[PDB]
């Protein structure tokens, strides 16, 4: 909630969406947020950051992706 | 008359503005927009900035090589093979970005509305 961070997600259609995520959110939770906003079922979603796959069970922080509030990662669906 | 023009446009109340082109003036104060990344949707006229290219010293958000968006300032542009590149400075350093890598936050785009808003 209060300490959430902005991320971007590029979908297969070329649309980029934003999400607010907790440093602690799991990848599954990120996929649920993408479903909730954009309608893509989690079973279709495979997320990557900078060419590396994001595993179910990890947070973005488990990948050292979230920085300060100045820099916002772009995740990509593949 | 706006058909065919390059613009930067958002599709949500608090969203970011993305580069694209108007392909049609449609009903109810909306315009069909083809975004440069291939997304097409109808957008409200109030959410369109008719600025092409984004002017010097505009504060923008740009996608760096490391796959982070962050703020920068436009310092130049280059047209090569029909494509536009922006020179944007971040933390004192300039790099070149494709047009489609340069977006505007709500605040950044609101700064441009008085001069470049449609309508």
TrEMBL record, chain B:
Subcellular location: Chromosome, Centromere, Kinetochore; Nucleus
Protein name: TP53-binding protein 1
Gene designation: TP53BP1
Residue range from the parent sequence: 1440 to 1558 of 1927
